Amino acid sequence: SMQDPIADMLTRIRNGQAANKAAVTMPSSKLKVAIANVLKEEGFIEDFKVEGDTKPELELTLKYFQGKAVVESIQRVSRPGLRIYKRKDELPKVMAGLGIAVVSTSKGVMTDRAARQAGLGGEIICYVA
Amino acid sequence: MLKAGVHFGHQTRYWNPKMKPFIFGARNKVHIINLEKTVPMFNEALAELNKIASRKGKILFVGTKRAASEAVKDAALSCDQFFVNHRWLGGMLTNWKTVRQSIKRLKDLETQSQDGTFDKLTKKEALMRTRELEKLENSLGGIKDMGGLPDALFVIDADHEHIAIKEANNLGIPVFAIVDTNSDPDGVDFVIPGNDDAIRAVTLYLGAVAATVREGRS
Amino acid sequence: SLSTEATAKIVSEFGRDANDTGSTEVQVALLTAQINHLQGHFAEHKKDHHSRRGLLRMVSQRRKLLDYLKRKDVARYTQLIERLGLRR
RNA sequence: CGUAAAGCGCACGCAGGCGGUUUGUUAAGUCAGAUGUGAAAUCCCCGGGCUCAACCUGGGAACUGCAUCUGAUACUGGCAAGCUUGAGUCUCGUAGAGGGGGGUAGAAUUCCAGGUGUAGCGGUGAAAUGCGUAGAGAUCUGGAGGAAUACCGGUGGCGAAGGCGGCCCCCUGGACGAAGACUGACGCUCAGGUGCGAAAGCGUGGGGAGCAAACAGGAUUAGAUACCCUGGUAGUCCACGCCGUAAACGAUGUCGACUUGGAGGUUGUGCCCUUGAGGCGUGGCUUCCGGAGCUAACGCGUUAAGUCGACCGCCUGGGGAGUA
Ligand SMILES: [Mg+2]
Ligand SMILES: [Mg+2]
Ligand SMILES: [Mg+2]
Ligand SMILES: [Mg+2]
Ligand SMILES: [Mg+2]
Ligand SMILES: [Mg+2]
Ligand SMILES: [Mg+2]
Ligand SMILES: [Mg+2]
Ligand SMILES: [Mg+2]
Ligand SMILES: [Mg+2]
Ligand SMILES: [Mg+2]
Ligand SMILES: [Mg+2]
Ligand SMILES: [Mg+2]
Ligand SMILES: [Mg+2]
Ligand SMILES: [Mg+2]
Ligand SMILES: [Mg+2]
Ligand SMILES: [Mg+2]
Ligand SMILES: [Mg+2]
Ligand SMILES: [Mg+2]
Numbered sequence: 001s002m003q004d005p006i007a008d009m010l011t012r013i014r015n016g017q018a019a020n021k022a023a024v025t026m027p028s029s030k031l032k033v034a035i036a037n038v039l040k041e042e043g044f045i046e047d048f049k050v051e052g053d054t055k056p057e058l059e060l061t062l063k064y065f066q067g068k069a070v071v072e073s074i075q076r077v078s079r080p081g082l083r084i085y086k087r088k089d090e091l092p093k094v095m096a097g098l099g100i101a102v103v104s105t106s107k108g109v110m111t112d113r114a115a116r117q118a119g120l121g122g123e124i125i126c127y128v129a
Numbered sequence: 130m131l132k133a134g135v136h137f138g139h140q141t142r143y144w145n146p147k148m149k150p151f152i153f154g155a156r157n158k159v160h161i162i163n164l165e166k167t168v169p170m171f172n173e174a175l176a177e178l179n180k181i182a183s184r185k186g187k188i189l190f191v192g193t194k195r196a197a198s199e200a201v202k203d204a205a206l207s208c209d210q211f212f213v214n215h216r217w218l219g220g221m222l223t224n225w226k227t228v229r230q231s232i233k234r235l236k237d238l239e240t241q242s243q244d245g246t247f248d249k250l251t252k253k254e255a256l257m258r259t260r261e262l263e264k265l266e267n268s269l270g271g272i273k274d275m276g277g278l279p280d281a282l283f284v285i286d287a288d289h290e291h292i293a294i295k296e297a298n299n300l301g302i303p304v305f306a307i308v309d310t311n312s313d314p315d316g317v318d319f320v321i322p323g324n325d326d327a328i329r330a331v332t333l334y335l336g337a338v339a340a341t342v343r344e345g346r347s
Numbered sequence: 348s349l350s351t352e353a354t355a356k357i358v359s360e361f362g363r364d365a366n367d368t369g370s371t372e373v374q375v376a377l378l379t380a381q382i383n384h385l386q387g388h389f390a391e392h393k394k395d396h397h398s399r400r401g402l403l404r405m406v407s408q409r410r411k412l413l414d415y416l417k418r419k420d421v422a423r424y425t426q427l428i429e430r431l432g433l434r435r
Numbered sequence: 436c437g438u439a440a441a442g443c444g445c446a447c448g449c450a451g452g453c454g455g456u457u458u459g460u461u462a463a464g465u466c467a468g469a470u471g472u473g474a475a476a477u478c479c480c481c482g483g484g485c486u487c488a489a490c491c492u493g494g495g496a497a498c499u500g501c502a503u504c505u506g507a508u509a510c511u512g513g514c515a516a517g518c519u520u521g522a523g524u525c526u527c528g529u530a531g532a533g534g535g536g537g538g539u540a541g542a543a544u545u546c547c548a549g550g551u552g553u554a555g556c557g558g559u560g561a562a563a564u565g566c567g568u569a570g571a572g573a574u575c576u577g578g579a580g581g582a583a584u585a586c587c588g589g590u591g592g593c594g595a596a597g598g599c600g601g602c603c604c605c606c607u608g609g610a611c612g613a614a615g616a617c618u619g620a621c622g623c624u625c626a627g628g629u630g631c632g633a634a635a636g637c638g639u640g641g642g643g644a645g646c647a648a649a650c651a652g653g654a655u656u657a658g659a660u661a662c663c664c665u666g667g668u669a670g671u672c673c674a675c676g677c678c679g680u681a682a683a684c685g686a687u688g689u690c691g692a693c694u695u696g697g698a699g700g701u702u703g704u705g706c707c708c709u710u711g712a713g714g715c716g717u718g719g720c721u722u723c724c725g726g727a728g729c730u731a732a733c734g735c736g737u738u739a740a741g742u743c744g745a746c747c748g749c750c751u752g753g754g755g756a757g758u759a
Contacts, residue, residue: 001623001691002521003454004744008692011743015693018728018742026692027520029456034509055520056456080453081745083511085465090499104509106466120466123510146695146726348607351526358525362617368525369618377524388535388606396631397534397594401608403447403630410448412523415621 006031007076009058010126013045017062017069028056034109035125036060038102042111044071044128075127077101088121099129131164136323136330138162140310148310151322160310167322171334174319175341178281178305182209183345187277190335191293192285193217197331201285202270205335208343211279212271213293221272222279222296232272235265281305283338286325287312307334349381371416372427378409379431 002008009032016024026032028050036048036058046061063070078084086092086103091112094101101112105122115121138154138161151167154160179186190205190212192198198214206212213221221228239262241247250258282297284290284306294316297304307321307330314320324330354377359365361373385402389395413434417424428434 001454001745003623003691003746005455005692007744012693015742019694021694024693027455031510054518076744078510079744080511083465085510087466104465106507106509108509110509120507122466125510142697144696149695354525358617366525367617369523369616371524371618371621374524374618385607392535392606395535395607398606398608399534400446400595400631401534404608407447408523412621419619419621 004076004080005029006035006125007079009035010074010076013060013062013071014074017071020064020069021062023059023061025057025059028052028058031109032058034104035102038100038109038111039128042100042128071128072099073127073129077124077126084124086121086124088116088119091116091121092124092127094127095129099127102126102128130168132168133164133323133330133333136327136333137164138310139324139327143311145311145313147314148308148312148322151320152310154310162310162322162324164323170319170321171337174305174321175338177303177319178283178338179341179345181281181303182342185277185280186210186342186345187275187280188342189213189271189279189282190338191217191282191290192331192335194286194289194326197285197326197328198267200328200332201335203336204339204343206271208339210339210342211273211275213268214270215268217290217293218268219292220296222293222300222302225275225279228272231265231269235262235269235273238262238265284317285331285335287314287317289326305338349377349384353380371412371419372423375409375412375416375427376431378405378412379433381405382409 005027009026012024012026015021033048033050036045039045039060040047044063046063048061049059051057051059091103092101093112102109102125103112103115103122104110104125105115105118105120107118107120109125110118112124138152138156139159141159144152144160151163152160153163153165182188186209188210190201190210192201193213193215201212201214218228218231238258242262248255279297279300279302281303282293282305284293284304287294287306287308288311290306294304294306296302298316303319304317305319305321306317307323307325308314308317309323309325312325321334323334355365357377357380358368358373361376362368362370367373382402382405385405389399389402413424413428416427
């Protein structure tokens, strides 16, 4: 049941990507957006798009580089059944450094590179590479 | 733009999802391919085709079916080009080194047709040895001499030539091929949409390919 | 499963107006209705085990709906159970 | 946790876990900093002293912890007020062996009665036991009784599972579709709990045609407590109440979101000179095949065994034992 939408984002992506699907859409939200941001700003998607008002619609443009899909993997990490939180010094780094981790903090949804510089930490939403 | 008079498209259901991007069909229980997307695939097609033919063209106009076999042993055959117009004896590329002597027996025989022993032995052996040579001739004509290793490959019907193409893929050989609405692409590097078993889209492109190897750098 | 005449009657006895059909109180009442109607069907028969499943559904549906209201507007809840006559 | 150990036979639901979307507020979870504390020894790093080493020792580092104060507000939790797609309610229809009750029909069997008719019938691999001269079987006619519903009938349909097939009425559950109208997160799951649950079996009463555990007879066999035959009691049927198990199986828990296709079956509904017995769409359910992908493999494959999330149940070598 709708229960975890953030996995649904992470997933609709993972799926559509593997389906060499040009775009992909879904119900939006403050939260979905903050991440669609980091995803773009880190260059895993071409560009997003929210086209509604009462029933908003997040839309992401996917990317394919060589023949592959750019996003080689995208997992949840925190989730309703089991919340994760890491302090700053205990923040994770994906693929040794390549690829990234999306961490929400008292100063907004930002990557691990980011939050690590910001000198803080929060709930580690998901891993991307 | 178009030049294919009536090859439009072809092939009904039996379609391959992956061949959607080159379809705009929907005429009476059969797809017409996207004519206006096939020609931008003569661009690139005969291009890297010729771009190597001047670098020196070694080809393999591979295409079979008792219904277009002879129309492949043609100007396709004639030029800077080799060919196969019958049963693609499997492993003929991947096992050339075994098959290399399936050749020695063709020559060492015909070279001896109006030469060597011939009208002699028995008039049993006679056509009872030209059967040895007739058999060899088709499937192992075009091969005859391979002077310059199989270099690109041009095939009439992608999947009908399962094996051929696969072998290429295995050996790193460009594979230029036309692919019907039904056939799997992706086995083909330089993919050519449109009908692949009608007397025209053959000859046309076929004969049109013969016209670009046969001339590149004088 | 209850009449259009009858169901209508009660929407019009409980809601703001006919049309205010999906109001908590209305649902509850038109359920409550079918429940009590039914009490006499299963009075005889009794071995109508299958139909019974539907009846419990009605009760457990109503039960959750009644639970909702209470949390929402407690004031509306009490009126309801009084007027409908249950929750001894 | 399909087939190897492992999805409770099925459902409803309390507690519990989890929960769409918006704004404000809170600052508990979370995060930040500061302060204090975290005994010494030990461990570790760099040294120092015993001829080396073990050993001894200086000094650091570390003790990943806890508390207090002040801050940060994205996420989670709390409070508030909303929102409409999640979930319900409402309207007209549709298909259905979904359930409960009552009524009724034809075909056959067995039996009873009678016509005709006469020496066999019946049964097996072969036999015999059995049945017939008190007239059998055969045939025809009338009647009694119980039990099940041929044809339709179909990888057809309904139900949560069990499981539900003549016809008719009455009572009743669910599912689906088309329009818009109403409620406004009312939801998902669910240990405990409660209900349901084939066949057999038990209890009191009925009921008894056919079938048939037990039992009896006849055979077969080396034996034959069997398979076969002639008989046949419980039972199989009805009401009421028990029992609570099945290879109760898709051997696959429930809900939701996402992901190439192909040929059917079944059931709604929109549009098209209805001008074709159709033409093009658009839902529900269903069968076969097959792509990615998944698998130990077989195989599964938009009805997942693929990709993800919420919750529950269960597994941890065979035997012993689902026993004590
Ligand atoms: Mg097992
Ligand atoms: Mg089960
Ligand atoms: Mg939310
Ligand atoms: Mg210490
Ligand atoms: Mg020393
Ligand atoms: Mg909040
Ligand atoms: Mg009779
Ligand atoms: Mg009679
Ligand atoms: Mg109904
Ligand atoms: Mg029971
Ligand atoms: Mg029974
Ligand atoms: Mg009894
Ligand atoms: Mg017997
Ligand atoms: Mg059991
Ligand atoms: Mg089954
Ligand atoms: Mg399959
Ligand atoms: Mg399908
Ligand atoms: Mg699954
Ligand atoms: Mg026991």
